[PDB]
Structure formats: C-alpha cells, structure tokens
C-alpha cells in the first residue's frame, strides 16, 4: 500500500522485492535486508548522483515512483497499473 515518490520533470518507475512472500494469510511478510533494501537504496543513490551532475541532463530533474512486488507475480502485476493509469506519466521502468 506504500509507494516512494520523488518530484521531477520526468518520472522513472521502479520495482523491487522489498518483502518476502508471506503466504496464504498475508501477501507480504518479512523484509529482504540485502536484495530488497540495498538495491533500492542503490537506485536512490544513483538518482542523487545524477541530479547533481552538470554534464548529464543539466536542466532536467528526474523523479521516481518506486513500488514493491512482495516477491509475487500477481501482486507485482496489481501494483504495475500505476505505471499505465496515466494513459503522472511514467517514461520508463527499472
């Protein structure tokens, strides 16, 4: 139910497995400390480095709309409608 949002001129979506598949009762259970959190912080770190780069897109600021898949394909597909509901618009998906 949560989404990470950062303002910008062009918005790039993201999809990461922050949570392990909980099971029948719950879709999302415990957190991935290595493949869930570190990878997302890596994407944020790259975005920060680009946004203070003068040689790469000096006048355009990139936003972000990052979602969570909970290591399940049905859950991931339900979340992915945010990318296509516009047609804020999403330029590309990491």
């Amino acid at each position: 139910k949560k989404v990470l949002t950062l303002e910008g001129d062009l918005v790039l979506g993201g999809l990461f497995p922050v949570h392990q598949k909980g099971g029948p009762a719950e879709d999302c259970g415990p957190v991935n400390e290595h493949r869930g959190i570190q990878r997302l912080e890596a994407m944020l770190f790259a975005l920060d480095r680009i946004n203070r780069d003068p040689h790469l897109l000096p006048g355009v600021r990139l936003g972000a709309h990052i979602l969570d898949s909970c290591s399940k394909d049905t859950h991931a597909l339900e979340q992915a409608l945010d990318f296509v509901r516009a047609s804020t618009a999403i330029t590309g998906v990491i």
Binding site: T74, L77, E78, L81
Partner: protein
Amino acid sequence: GGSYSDVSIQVANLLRLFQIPQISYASTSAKLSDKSRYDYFARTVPPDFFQAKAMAEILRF
C-alpha cells in the same frame, strides 16, 4: 471466449485486474484450475488431468 489455452491464460491475467468474468468453451489446460491466480475464470470442459489417464490406459490395454 478462449479456444487455445495460451490465449485463455493471457486474457485471464488481464481481466482479473478489472473484475470481469470469463467462461471458456475449448480450453482444457490444467493450470487454469488454480483459483489463487485465475480467480475469475470458468469453463464448460474438463481439464487435461483425465485425458492423460485415458491415453495411458489405452496404451496399457
């Protein structure tokens, strides 16, 4: 709709997002019996779980 199992599965993945019922008439794949994934799909034909039994029993005879 849905004559080939592949077409039915692909269409079912999309229709469950908008809550639209679907009834098939020729799709006999067994994968469609898992209601945790295809929770809006029905059909008037049996699955392929019994056709294998029939074929195997024909060979044994």
